[PDB]
Enzyme design. Structure first.
Site, PDB file in Angstrom:
ATOM      1  N   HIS A  67      -1.656  14.638  -2.630  1.00  0.00           N
ATOM      2  CA  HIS A  67      -0.885  15.364  -1.632  1.00  0.00           C
ATOM      3  C   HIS A  67      -0.491  16.762  -2.141  1.00  0.00           C
ATOM      4  O   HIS A  67      -1.098  17.282  -3.078  1.00  0.00           O
ATOM      5  CB  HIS A  67       0.337  14.531  -1.193  1.00  0.00           C
ATOM      6  CG  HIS A  67       1.281  14.153  -2.298  1.00  0.00           C
ATOM      7  ND1 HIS A  67       2.450  14.840  -2.506  1.00  0.00           N
ATOM      8  CD2 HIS A  67       1.202  13.134  -3.192  1.00  0.00           C
ATOM      9  CE1 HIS A  67       3.055  14.230  -3.508  1.00  0.00           C
ATOM     10  NE2 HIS A  67       2.336  13.191  -3.959  1.00  0.00           N
ATOM     11  N   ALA A  68       0.501  17.372  -1.497  1.00  0.00           N
ATOM     12  CA  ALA A  68       0.957  18.726  -1.851  1.00  0.00           C
ATOM     13  C   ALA A  68       1.455  18.847  -3.296  1.00  0.00           C
ATOM     14  O   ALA A  68       1.379  19.927  -3.884  1.00  0.00           O
ATOM     15  CB  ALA A  68       2.047  19.188  -0.890  1.00  0.00           C
TER      16      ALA A  68
END
Length: 88
Positions: free
Chosen positions: A15-16
Site C-alpha cells: 500500500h501507500a
C-alpha cells in the site's frame, strides 16, 4: 549479488506505506532489486511490478539487489517489505 525470500500477510499488498518506502529506500541505494514471487520474477517497482505478482497474504517472494549498495538494501528493504506484515 544479495537476495532474501519472504512470506508476508498483507492481503492488501504494498500500500501507500511500503510503496513510498521502497521508492526512497531502493532509490537511495540505486541498485536494482529483483523481487520475485512464488510464480513470477520482476523488480519490486511497487508501481506495478509488485502488483502483477500480487503481494497478498501468505505471499512468497525472493528479492535480489544488484547494483552498488545491494547489501545495505536487503536490511532496510526488509523493514519496508516487513511493514506489509503489520497489516493482517
Amino acid at each position: 549479488m544479495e537476495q532474501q525470500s519472504y512470506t508476508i500477510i498483507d492481503e492488501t499488498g504494498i500500500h501507500a506505506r511500503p510503496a513510498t518506502m521502497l521508492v526512497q529506500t531502493a532509490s537511495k541505494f540505486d541498485s536494482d532489486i529483483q523481487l520475485e514471487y512464488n510464480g513470477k520474477k520482476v523488480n519490486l517497482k511497487s508501481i506495478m511490478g509488485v502488483m502483477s505478482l500480487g503481494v497478498g497474504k501468505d505471499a512468497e517472494i525472493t528479492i535480489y539487489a544488484d547494483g552498488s549498495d545491494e547489501a545495505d538494501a536487503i536490511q532496510a528493504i526488509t523493514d519496508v517489505l516487513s511493514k506489509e506484515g503489520l497489516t493482517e
